[PDB]
Amino acid sequence: NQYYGTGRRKSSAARVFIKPGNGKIVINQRSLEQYFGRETARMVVRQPLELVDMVEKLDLYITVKGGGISGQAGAIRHGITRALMEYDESLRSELRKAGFVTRDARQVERKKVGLRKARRRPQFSKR
């Protein structure tokens, strides 16, 4: 049936439903090639399915809000990790040794008062 994963990354929120089936991936009524065209999420959504060789036997239904392109990519990857963790508790042990399980939090730093964009001080001059 349906195994659910959620993945958040850099203000992106993806929710993934994995099920047994084809290799076809559906994302916001679109395929993977027509939603993400660049290097990211033609690879990083394949990576948890590339660690354990099960690309063909399961199909995904992903819907995602927030962020940009690579943030949504990492959100989908972190959600596919949880969705495959719903398969087997040995899978999290096998893919904990390569990344993919950590939330990879690292939000943007808020702009500090007096500074310019939270680290860049404006051009100190002695005289």
**Residues lying near another protein in the complex (CB under 8 A):** 38-40, 42-44, 110, 113-114
Helix extents (H) in 22-112: 32-35, 47-51, 70-85, 91-95
Asked if 73 and 41 count as a contact pair (C-beta separation under 8 A), the reply is yes
- DSSP label of 118: S
Residues between 101 and 120 that touch RNA (CB under 7 A): 101-103, 105-120
Binding mask 56-95 for RNA (x = CB under 7 A): --------xxxxxxxxx-------------------xx--
Sheet (strand 3-9) strand order = 3-9, 12-20, 58-66, 25-27
Q: Is 124 an interacting residue with respect to RNA (CB under 7 A)? A: yes
* Residue number, 30 or 116, with CB nearest to another protein: 116
CA distance 125 to 27: 52
Residues that bind RNA (CB under 7 A): 4, 6, 8, 10-13, 15, 28-29, 35, 37-38, 40, 64-72, 92-93, 96, 101-103, 105-126
